[PDB]
Amino acid sequence: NFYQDGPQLSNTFRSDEALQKILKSLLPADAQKVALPHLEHLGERAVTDMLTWAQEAESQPPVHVPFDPWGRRIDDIKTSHGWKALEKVAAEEGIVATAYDRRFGAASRVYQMALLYLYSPSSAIFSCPLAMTDGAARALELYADADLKARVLPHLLSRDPKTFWTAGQWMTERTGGSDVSGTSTDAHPFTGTSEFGATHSLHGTKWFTSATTSQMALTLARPDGAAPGSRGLSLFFLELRNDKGELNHIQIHRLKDKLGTKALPTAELSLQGTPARMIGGVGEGVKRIASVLNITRIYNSICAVGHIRRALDLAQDYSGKRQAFGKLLKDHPLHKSTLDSLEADFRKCIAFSFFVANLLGQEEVGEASASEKILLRVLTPILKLYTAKKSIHISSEVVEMFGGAGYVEDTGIPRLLRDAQVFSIWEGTTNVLSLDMLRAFEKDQAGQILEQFLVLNEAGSEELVRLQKLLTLSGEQKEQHAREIAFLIGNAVARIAMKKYSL
């Protein structure tokens, strides 16, 4: 009898006209002759060996083994081979390292984000460890002494799987993740020896972490006698293991059982005298880790848009295979209209994301003006919250486009919704990032810089005037309308970027 043909993917570089148009606009000729063959290669991996490895990892979530059979506390995390293979891919394909090889100026970061864009949707969210890894590298690059950099950066930026390290960012505690002022981890002076010049020992509990699959982490802690709240916090570097391969006074409580990102180990950890090294000076921890957030927020946006592209690729292919009421779905005007609406949102998201990625590249190579640095600071929280909300909306619509099959896990479709929902939570909720945006307006004339940019780049008169109205509201009402303001700006910049890239 009848069996429905399921959705199939095709090379995700060649299938993505929007990505190609953007790169033709943002990459100079010399970058293109390196980057484009690499991207076509990665696009093939994304739908072949990576796709298989990601499915394996999703199907075999990590398992915590606290004790060996004779009672020794080992806190092992067992992972799938697929998960380990995707880590090796991240190293050898230079998914992080490409940004730090600045041959192509601002285009180095654009090239790297393009690699991430293809890699992430077939990575079972290994792209999240990559974001934290990239962030840690930059933080060390900016603030760490020469000896610490010489030790760690060759690992984080390695193209060699056998020497590649990932980093964790352990910022969230039970008191809060949005607000870290309640951080209860203490840092006592330490005078023992260590391989990285530890200065303190850490004591506390970290409530969401990427567990023990990372070799290093950055974290916040409060030194003996330091002030209460955020001002008392310093940034610390630590390595998870010693020479032995033994955990450095770190205990794993358990893995979280999550809605999605199931292949990613997310653990609750206790630091029990973990040796650590302060990065920067006392009380500057929050500000120091602040200057990395443009990276992690932009990784999140690019991953969210890659996720959107994956969901739509599956939906588009199915729409040309499933018939109802005598027609293929793609030929039903209402279905086609729905598809078109989602694709239009996709084009906004990818243009907005790469516009901002290019600004990040400019800043990293020292080409950004003072005002441009402020503009980047304003746009990244907006980009993040905008692409994340769109990714959830689009994923939910795609689940429904598959009908009953979309609700059944072995089709691979429910994962689209479960994983998308993370994008609007980690690294800031919609509302927290909307307030970060509003806050930014208050300082360094950020509001005016944003307005000059929108006027110069010919944002719509209607949206310009509506923005001016919203920004004249009371403090209280601007907070109440902070989402509206963020999405107004996001849509305006997305349209500007689309025109710029001829999308």
Cα 142 from Cα 480, distance rounded (Å): 36
Task: Read off the tokens for 108.
Answer: 């180095």
Shortest distance (Å) from residue 403 CB to a second copy = 6
Can residue 43 be called a binding residue for a second copy (CB under 8 A)? no
Of positions 253, 330, 373, 500, contacts a second copy by CB under 8 A: 253
The Cβ-side half-sphere exposure at 472, using a 13 Å CA radius, reads: 6
C-alpha distances in Å from residue 332, one per residue of 132, 211, 309, 316, 417: 44, 48, 22, 13, 24
Name which of 1, 48, 3, 12 is nearest 308 in CA terms.
12
Binders of a second copy among 92-131, rule CB under 8 A?
A: none
Q: Examine residue 70 and tell whether it contacts a second copy (CB under 8 A).
A: yes
| Candidate residues 28, 480, 499, 502; the one interacting with a second copy per rule CB under 8 A | 480
The answer to the question of residue 333 lying near a second copy (CB under 8 A) is: yes
DSSP character for 97?
G
Using CB under 8 A, which of 14, 24, 33, 81 touches a second copy? 81
Binding of a second copy by 179 (CB under 8 A) = yes
Establish whether 404 is an annotated binding residue: yes
**Residue from 67, 287, 344, 468 binding a second copy (CB under 8 A):** 67
Residue with Cβ nearer a second copy (249 or 373) = 249
Site size toward a second copy (CB under 8 A) is: 79
Q: Which span (33-41, 110-118, 135-143, 317-325) binds a second copy, by CB under 8 A?
A: 317-325
Site for a second copy in 335-394 (CB under 8 A): 335-338, 392
One of 169, 294, 430, 491 touching a second copy (CB under 8 A): 430
What is the closest distance, in whole angstroms, from the C-beta atom of residue 441 to a second copy in the complex?
Answer: 15
The answer to whether 57 contacts a second copy (rule: CB under 8 A) is no
Q: Which is nearer to a second copy, 166 or 395 (CB)?
A: 395
Is 178 labelled as part of a ligand binding site?
yes
Site membership for a second copy, residue 396 (CB under 8 A):
yes
Q: Does 287 bind a second copy (CB under 8 A)?
A: no
427-428-433 Cα angle (round to 5): 130
Give the Cα separation of 236 and 370 in Å (integer): 29
Non-local (6+) Cβ contacts of 48 within 8 A are none
Q: Which of 88, 373, 418, 500 binds a second copy (CB under 8 A)?
A: 418
Q: Does 483 bind a second copy (CB under 8 A)?
A: yes
For residues 305 and 428, what is the distance between their CA atoms, to the nearest angstrom?
17
- The count of C-alpha atoms lying within 13 angstroms of the C-alpha of 481, restricted to the half-sphere facing its C-beta, is 16
Which residues neighbour 246 within 8 Å (Cβ) at sequence distance 6 or greater? none
> Nearest CA to 366 among 93, 97, 142?
142
DSSP per-residue codes, 320-341: TT-EETTEEGGGSHHHHHHHHH
Exposed, middle or buried, 136 (CB in 10 Å: 0-12/13-18/19+)? buried
Asked whether position 330 contacts a second copy by CB under 8 A, the answer is no
Q: 52 labelled as ligand-binding?
A: no
* Stretch touching a second copy by CB under 8 A, among 113-121, 333-341, 356-364, 457-465: 333-341
**Residue 431 binds a second copy, judged by CB under 8 A:** yes
User: Counting contacts by CB under 8 A, is residue 426 touching a second copy?
Assistant: yes
Is 281 annotated to bind ligand?
Answer: no
Q: Is 409 left (phi over 0), alpha (psi -120 to 50) or beta?
A: alpha
Provide the annotated binding site for FAD. Answer: 169, 171-172, 177-178, 322, 400, 404, 429
Provide the annotated binding site. Answer: 169, 171-172, 177-178, 322, 400, 404, 429
